[PDB]
Amino acid sequence: XXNXX
Amino acid sequence: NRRQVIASDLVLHHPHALTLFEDFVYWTDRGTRQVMQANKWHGGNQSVVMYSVHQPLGITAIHPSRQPPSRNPCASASCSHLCLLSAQAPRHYSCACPSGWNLSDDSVNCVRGDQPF
Amino acid sequence: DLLYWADASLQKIERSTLTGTNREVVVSTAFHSFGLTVYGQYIYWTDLYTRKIYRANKYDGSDLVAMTTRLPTQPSGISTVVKTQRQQCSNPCDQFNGGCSHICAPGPNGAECQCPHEGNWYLANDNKYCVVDTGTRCNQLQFTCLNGHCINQDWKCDNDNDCGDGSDELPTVCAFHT
Amino acid sequence: XXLXXX
Amino acid sequence: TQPFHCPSTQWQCPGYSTCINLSALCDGVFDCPNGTDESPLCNQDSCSHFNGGCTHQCMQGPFGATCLCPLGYQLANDTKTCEDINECDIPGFCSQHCVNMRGSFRCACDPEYTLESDGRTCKVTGSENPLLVVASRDKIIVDNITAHTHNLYSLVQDVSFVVALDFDSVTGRVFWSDLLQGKTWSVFQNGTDKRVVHDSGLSVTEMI
Ligand SMILES: *[C@@H]1O[C@H](CO)[C@@H](O[C@@H]2O[C@H](CO)[C@@H](O[C@@H]3O[C@H](CO)[C@@H](O)[C@H](O)[C@@H]3O)[C@H](O)[C@H]2NC(C)=O)[C@H](O)[C@H]1NC(C)=O
Ligand SMILES: *[C@@H]1O[C@H](CO)[C@@H](O[C@@H]2O[C@H](CO)[C@@H](O)[C@H](O)[C@H]2NC(C)=O)[C@H](O)[C@H]1NC(C)=O
Ligand SMILES: *[C@@H]1O[C@H](CO)[C@@H](O[C@@H]2O[C@H](CO)[C@@H](O)[C@H](O)[C@H]2NC(C)=O)[C@H](O)[C@H]1NC(C)=O
Ligand SMILES: *[C@@H]1O[C@H](CO)[C@@H](O)[C@H](O)[C@H]1NC(C)=O
Ligand SMILES: *[C@H]1O[C@H](CO)[C@H](O)[C@H](O)[C@H]1NC(C)=O
Ligand SMILES: [Ca+2]
Ligand SMILES: [Ca+2]
Ligand SMILES: [Ca+2]
Ligand SMILES: [Ca+2]
């Protein structure tokens, strides 16, 4: 998964 | 004597079944689809035993220690069909018989029930 | 004086002393933790996965509850609003801009100073003045005025101008001079 | 996950 | 060299550099602004009036007598009494059977287990191999737990939806139920000789 907001 | 092993914790999502061993407790989660291990007294030393693609429902630990031996009072019973253990002190066994059968007054022999249904 | 950090991949929140010695896990399995704050006895963090705000005891993570329901749109960032003044102390930068040109920050020992964002700057005069790095320096006997004009340190703050802009006689250096 | 095993 | 404190017969109030001598300690009112000039227990007893009142062992430091309890005992709410802790009340301190003793504990466990070198942990007396079996949808996965290592393999070949599991020690057979097939099966732990137990009458077997 991504780690951005 | 009610105690909490794991509580107020996010390690549990939708746990289904558990089994024990020496100072360890194993359980399966249907939410995260993984089998877990923890200390059975305070829930520490946790780790993931297994990841499963499908939901893991059942779990058992196979070992003789999980299956302690004892005397079999039912082994001396004269009950026909079913002989079920019981907690009553004098005998610790009780005769029973399947669906559609009649318990005779002998308390050990059963006869098929011919009544309609 | 403890430092708390939350890892969104290992999925746990940890604490340690300000020197980073005593690592401990205050709460394991904290999900996809975004920014975290500490107030009172509890620590509060926002989770990107379950879209909730959680709390737990700051020492052992025992009383873990969710502060809100499932928020509609994935909260991010959290802080605490407090009315009481917090640990006030006297900074050295108020007095004559900490003895520096324009920008200073209170460091562990005295005022600590830095140059602006834009420009090929470099530090001079015990790193208290900001000048343009023209590829030139002056030796241990010349004081450096601003813009690079550098003259012998005896005239430095002699209550007489010695440069093209009066940089030497600025009060920033003459506030405490020998 | 729902409770019913089905 | 040249120490930055007061050596010899002086003691310093923490939070300050104020040095006071051996007689100024707890001389009266809390003179040091931090309150460390005096302590709540300061010279409660001289550690000479019948062991200073402490039930086991008194000793006087800079701030008067302190009561010592032997390893296992605990200082009571009243500081001068040492009492026995109930080590069996802590859950899991003794694995199976705990007996509280005077400043001590006793442990034992069932004949299937043997107590370890430490008098708390009990381990299975037989070697065998602790075998963990988990019911995934289309596969019955069995783990061979040994030396902190898990080995995964499939017990049986033709299951569809297993929801429940158990085993019989006498015959060494694993019992499981299939939700889609509506049957209960029994097989040996090596995957051979699978038999049907219930072929009808089962709808949703939650547990066995
Ligand atoms: C999988 O494990 C089971 C565990 O029971 C094995 O069953 C056991 O197999 C042995 C050898 O076939 C049986 O011993 C034999 O017993 C007969 C009398 O019944 C005797 O005449 C032979 O000389 C021999 O001793 C043993 O009884 C049997 N256990 C039970 C409880 O039935 C099975 O063989 C294993 N399968 C594989 C493929 O390894
Ligand atoms: C995980 O296991 C470790 C030991 O490997 C536990 O750590 C010790 O636990 C005992 C009993 O509470 C303490 O007396 C020791 O001081 C602990 N030592 C260390 C190195 O921490 C630990 O408690 C277990 N996990 C948790 C969270 O309970
Ligand atoms: C779990 O693993 C152990 C170790 O590999 C297995 O024990 C061996 O079993 C074979 C027979 O299949 C024996 O010939 C070896 O002597 C055994 N070795 C040891 C170290 O005991 C054991 O069979 C496995 N258990 C199961 C049920 O799969
Ligand atoms: C000790 O005594 C005080 C005052 O009676 C009481 O409030 C406290 O709970 C006691 N603590 C213990 C652990 O005995
Ligand atoms: C002033 O001159 C003395 C001469 O010994 C020292 O160099 C001192 O560091 C100087 N301080 C300032 C602020 O100019
Ligand atoms: Ca849940
Ligand atoms: Ca000058
Ligand atoms: Ca005093
Ligand atoms: Ca005791």
Rg over alpha carbons of chain A = 4 Å
Helix content of chain A: under 10%
Query: Alpha-carbon distance between the termini of chain A?
Result: 11 Å
Outline of chain D: elongated
Count of separate DSSP helical elements of chain A: 0
Count of helix runs of chain D? 0
**Radius of gyration of chain D, taken over Cα atoms and rounded to an integer in Å:** 5 Å
The helicity of chain D comes to under 10%
Which secondary-structure class do the elements of chain D indicate? little secondary structure
The ligands bound in this entry are: a molecule of 3 linked components (NAG-NAG-BMA), a molecule of 2 linked components (NAG-NAG), 2-acetamido-2-deoxy-beta-D-glucopyranose, 2-acetamido-2-deoxy-alpha-D-galactopyranose, calcium ion
Strand composition percent of chain D: under 5%
- The percent range for strand residues of chain A is under 5%
Oligomer status: part of a larger assembly
Number of extended strands of chain D? 0
PDB class: endocytosis
Keywords: endocytosis receptor, endocytosis
Entry title: rat megalin head
Chain A: unclear peptide
